[PDB]
CSV table of C-alpha atoms and ligand atoms in Angstrom, one decimal:
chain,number,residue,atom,x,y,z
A,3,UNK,CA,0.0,0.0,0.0
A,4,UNK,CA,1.0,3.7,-0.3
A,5,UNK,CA,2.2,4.7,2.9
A,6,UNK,CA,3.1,8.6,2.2
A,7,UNK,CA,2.6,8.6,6.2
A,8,UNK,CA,5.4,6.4,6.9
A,9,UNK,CA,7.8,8.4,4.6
A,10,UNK,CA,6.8,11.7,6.3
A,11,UNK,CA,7.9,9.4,9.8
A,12,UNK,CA,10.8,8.3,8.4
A,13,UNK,CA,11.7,11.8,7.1
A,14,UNK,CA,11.4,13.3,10.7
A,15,UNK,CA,13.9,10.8,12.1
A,16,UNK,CA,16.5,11.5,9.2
A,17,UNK,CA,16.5,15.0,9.9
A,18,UNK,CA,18.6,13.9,12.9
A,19,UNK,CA,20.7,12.1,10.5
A,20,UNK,CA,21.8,14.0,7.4
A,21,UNK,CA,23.8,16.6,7.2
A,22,UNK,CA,23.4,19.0,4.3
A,23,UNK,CA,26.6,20.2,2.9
A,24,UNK,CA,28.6,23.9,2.3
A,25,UNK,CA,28.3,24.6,-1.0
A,26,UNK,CA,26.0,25.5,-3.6
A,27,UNK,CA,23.9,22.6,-5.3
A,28,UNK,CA,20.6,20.9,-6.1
A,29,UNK,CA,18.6,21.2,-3.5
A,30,UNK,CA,15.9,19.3,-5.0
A,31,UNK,CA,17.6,16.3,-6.0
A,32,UNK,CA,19.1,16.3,-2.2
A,33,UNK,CA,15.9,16.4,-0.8
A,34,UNK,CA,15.6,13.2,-3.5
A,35,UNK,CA,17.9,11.3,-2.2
A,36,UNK,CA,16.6,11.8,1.8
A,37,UNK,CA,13.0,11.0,0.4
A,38,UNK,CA,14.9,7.5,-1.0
A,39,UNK,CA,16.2,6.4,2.7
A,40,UNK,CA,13.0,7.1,4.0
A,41,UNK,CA,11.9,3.8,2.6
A,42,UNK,CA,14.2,2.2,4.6
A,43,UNK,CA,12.5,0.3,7.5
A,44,UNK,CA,12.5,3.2,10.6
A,45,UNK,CA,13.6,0.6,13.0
A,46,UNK,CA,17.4,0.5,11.2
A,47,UNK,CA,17.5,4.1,10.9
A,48,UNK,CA,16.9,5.2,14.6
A,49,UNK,CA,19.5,2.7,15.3
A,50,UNK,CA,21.6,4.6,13.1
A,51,UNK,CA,20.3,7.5,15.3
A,52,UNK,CA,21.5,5.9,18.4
A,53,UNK,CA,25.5,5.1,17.2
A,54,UNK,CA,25.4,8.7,15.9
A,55,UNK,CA,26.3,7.7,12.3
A,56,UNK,CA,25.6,10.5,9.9
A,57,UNK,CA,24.9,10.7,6.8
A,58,UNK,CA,26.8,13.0,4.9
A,59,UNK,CA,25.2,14.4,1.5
A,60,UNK,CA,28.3,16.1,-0.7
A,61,UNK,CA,28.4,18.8,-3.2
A,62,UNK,CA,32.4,17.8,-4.4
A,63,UNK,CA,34.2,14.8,-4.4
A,64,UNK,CA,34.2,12.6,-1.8
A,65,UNK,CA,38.3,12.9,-1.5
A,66,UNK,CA,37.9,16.6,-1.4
A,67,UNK,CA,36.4,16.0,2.8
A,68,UNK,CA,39.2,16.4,5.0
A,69,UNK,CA,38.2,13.0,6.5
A,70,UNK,CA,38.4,11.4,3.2
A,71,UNK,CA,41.4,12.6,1.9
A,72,UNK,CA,42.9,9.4,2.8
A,73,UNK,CA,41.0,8.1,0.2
A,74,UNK,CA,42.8,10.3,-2.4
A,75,UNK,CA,44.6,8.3,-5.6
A,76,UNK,CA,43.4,4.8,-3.9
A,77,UNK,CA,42.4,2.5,-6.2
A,78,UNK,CA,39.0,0.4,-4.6
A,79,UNK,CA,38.6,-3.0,-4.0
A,80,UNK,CA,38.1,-4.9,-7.1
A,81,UNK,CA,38.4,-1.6,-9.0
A,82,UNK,CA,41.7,-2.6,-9.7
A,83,UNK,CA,43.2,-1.8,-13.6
A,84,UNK,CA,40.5,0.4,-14.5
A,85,UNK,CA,42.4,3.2,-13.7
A,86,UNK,CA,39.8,4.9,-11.2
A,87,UNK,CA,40.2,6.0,-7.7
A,88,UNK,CA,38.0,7.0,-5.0
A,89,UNK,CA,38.5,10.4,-6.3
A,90,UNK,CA,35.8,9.4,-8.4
A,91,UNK,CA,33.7,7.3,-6.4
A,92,UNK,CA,30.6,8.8,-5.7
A,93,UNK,CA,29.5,7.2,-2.2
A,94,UNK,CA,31.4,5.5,0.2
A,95,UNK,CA,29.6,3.6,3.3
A,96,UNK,CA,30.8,1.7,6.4
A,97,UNK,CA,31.9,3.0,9.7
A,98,UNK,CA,30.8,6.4,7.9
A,99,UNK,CA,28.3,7.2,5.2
A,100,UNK,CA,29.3,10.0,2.3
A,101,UNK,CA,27.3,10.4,-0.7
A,102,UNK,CA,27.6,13.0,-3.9
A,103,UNK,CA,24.2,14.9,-4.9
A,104,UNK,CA,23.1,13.8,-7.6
A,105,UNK,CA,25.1,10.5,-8.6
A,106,UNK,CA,22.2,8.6,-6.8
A,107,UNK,CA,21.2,6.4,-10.4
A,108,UNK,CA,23.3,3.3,-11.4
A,109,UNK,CA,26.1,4.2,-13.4
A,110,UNK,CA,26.9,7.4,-12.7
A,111,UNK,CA,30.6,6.4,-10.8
A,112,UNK,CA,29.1,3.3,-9.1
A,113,UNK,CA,27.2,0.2,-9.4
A,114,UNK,CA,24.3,0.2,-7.4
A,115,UNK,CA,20.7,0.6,-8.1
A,116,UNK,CA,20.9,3.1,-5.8
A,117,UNK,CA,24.0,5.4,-4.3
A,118,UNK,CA,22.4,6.4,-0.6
A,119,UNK,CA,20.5,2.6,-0.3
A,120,UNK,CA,24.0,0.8,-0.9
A,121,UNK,CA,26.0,3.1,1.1
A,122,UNK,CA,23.8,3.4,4.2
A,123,UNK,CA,23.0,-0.5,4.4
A,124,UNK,CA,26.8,-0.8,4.9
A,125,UNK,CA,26.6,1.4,7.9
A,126,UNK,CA,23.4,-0.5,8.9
A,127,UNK,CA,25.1,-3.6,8.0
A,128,UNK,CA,28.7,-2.1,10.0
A,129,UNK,CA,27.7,-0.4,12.9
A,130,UNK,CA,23.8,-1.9,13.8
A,131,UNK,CA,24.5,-5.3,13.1
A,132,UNK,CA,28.2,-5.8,13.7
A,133,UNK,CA,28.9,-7.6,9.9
A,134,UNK,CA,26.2,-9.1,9.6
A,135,UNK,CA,27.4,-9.8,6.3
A,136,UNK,CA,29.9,-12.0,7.5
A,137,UNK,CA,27.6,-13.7,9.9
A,138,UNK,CA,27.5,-17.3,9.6
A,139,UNK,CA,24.0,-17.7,8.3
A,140,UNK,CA,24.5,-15.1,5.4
A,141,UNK,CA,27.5,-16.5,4.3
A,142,UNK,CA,25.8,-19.3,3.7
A,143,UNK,CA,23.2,-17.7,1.5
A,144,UNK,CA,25.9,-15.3,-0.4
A,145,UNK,CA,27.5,-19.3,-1.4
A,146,UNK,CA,24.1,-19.4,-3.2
A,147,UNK,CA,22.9,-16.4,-4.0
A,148,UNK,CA,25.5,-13.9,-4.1
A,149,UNK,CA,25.6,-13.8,-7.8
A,150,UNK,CA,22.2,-13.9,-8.9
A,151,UNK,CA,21.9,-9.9,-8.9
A,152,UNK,CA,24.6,-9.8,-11.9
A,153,UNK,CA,27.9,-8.6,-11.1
A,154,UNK,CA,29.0,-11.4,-10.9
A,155,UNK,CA,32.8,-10.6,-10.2
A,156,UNK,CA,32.2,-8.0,-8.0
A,157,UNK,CA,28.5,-8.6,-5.4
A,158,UNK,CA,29.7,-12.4,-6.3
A,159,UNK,CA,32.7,-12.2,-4.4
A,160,UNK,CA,32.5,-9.8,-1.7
A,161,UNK,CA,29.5,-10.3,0.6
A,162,UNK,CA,29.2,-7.2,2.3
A,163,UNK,CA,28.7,-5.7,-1.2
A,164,UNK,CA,26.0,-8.5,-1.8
A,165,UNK,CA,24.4,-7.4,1.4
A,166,UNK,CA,24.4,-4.0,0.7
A,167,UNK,CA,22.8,-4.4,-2.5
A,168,UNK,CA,20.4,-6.5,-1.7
A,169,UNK,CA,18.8,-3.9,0.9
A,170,UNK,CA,19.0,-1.6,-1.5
A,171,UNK,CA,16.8,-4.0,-4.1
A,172,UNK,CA,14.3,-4.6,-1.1
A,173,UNK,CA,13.8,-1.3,0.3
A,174,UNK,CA,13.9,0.9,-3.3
A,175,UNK,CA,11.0,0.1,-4.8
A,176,UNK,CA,8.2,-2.4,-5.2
A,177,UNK,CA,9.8,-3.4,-8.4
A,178,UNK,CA,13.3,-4.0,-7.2
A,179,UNK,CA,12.0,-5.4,-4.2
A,180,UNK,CA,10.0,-8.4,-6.2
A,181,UNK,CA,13.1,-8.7,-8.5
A,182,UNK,CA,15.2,-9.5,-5.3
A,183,UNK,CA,12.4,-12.1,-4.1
A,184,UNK,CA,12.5,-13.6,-7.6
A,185,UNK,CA,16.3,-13.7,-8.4
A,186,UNK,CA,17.5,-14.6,-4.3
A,187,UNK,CA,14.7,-15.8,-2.1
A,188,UNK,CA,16.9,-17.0,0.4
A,189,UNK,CA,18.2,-13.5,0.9
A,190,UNK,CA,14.9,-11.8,0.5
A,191,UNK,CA,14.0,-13.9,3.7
A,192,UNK,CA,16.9,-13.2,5.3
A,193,UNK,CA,15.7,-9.6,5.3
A,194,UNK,CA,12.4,-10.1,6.2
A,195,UNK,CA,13.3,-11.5,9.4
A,196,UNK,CA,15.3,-9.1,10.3
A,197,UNK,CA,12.7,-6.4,9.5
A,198,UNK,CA,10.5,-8.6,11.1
B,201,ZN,ZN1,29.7,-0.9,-1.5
């Protein structure tokens, strides 16, 4: 059902967690990307809320944030001979969560369906639910599953970028959310225990 309710909820609790950043920008397609995590299920977000992880919209490159510029010239995991660095990676999620305005769509520097869905369900993933990724029981489902959203050399080798994706696929949209169910039902259960 349409539950413009729940995403006004949701949207009251992220005001606590985004932070909006210096410069100039789209304003629009910010507010966009905060309307996006508000599908996420409020439960993970106040969590979020609790650890005091923010979630860091960007108007420059992500190396460009003193905290990032460690990041600068490094070549990501299984980015290697493409010749890219993070300079050019658009989101970054973990024990932080940094995301560029407007690189949101697939494509555009990264691989995910969605930038702030991937990058925060590290975090949640990270911080809430101490690897969960690497858990035992998900391991056993990434042996299975972990390739049967494509990228297959990249979600099908590193789980925590299978679980990451995944929760993005559930909590997008309807449509991703029944392509997830379809393609890896063991990891679509997975998720709805632990929304449950
Ligand atoms: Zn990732």
């Amino acid at each position: 059902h349409m539950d413009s309710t729940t995403i006004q909820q949701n949207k009251d609790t992220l005001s606590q967690i985004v932070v909006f950043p210096t410069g100039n920008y789209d304003k629009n397609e910010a507010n966009a990307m905060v309307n996006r995590l508000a599908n996420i299920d409020g439960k993970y977000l106040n969590a979020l809320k609790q650890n005091n992880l923010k979630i860091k919209l960007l108007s420059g490159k992500l190396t460009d944030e003193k905290e990032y510029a460690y990041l600068k010239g490094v070549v990501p995991e299984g980015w290697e001979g493409t010749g890219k660095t993070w300079d050019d990676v658009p989101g970054l999620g973990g024990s932080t969560v940094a995301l560029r305005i407007g690189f949101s769509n697939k494509g555009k520097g990264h691989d995910a369906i969605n930038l702030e869905l991937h990058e925060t369900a590290h975090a949640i993933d990270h911080i809430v639910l101490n690897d969960i990724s690497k858990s035992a029981q998900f391991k056993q489902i990434f042996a299975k599953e972990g390739r049967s959203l494509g990228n297959v050399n990249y979600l099908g080798v590193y789980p925590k970028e299978f679980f990451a994706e995944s929760f993005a696929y559930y909590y997008l949209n309807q449509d991703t959310n029944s392509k997830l169910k379809s393609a890896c039902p063991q990891t679509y259960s997975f998720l709805q225990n632990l929304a449950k």
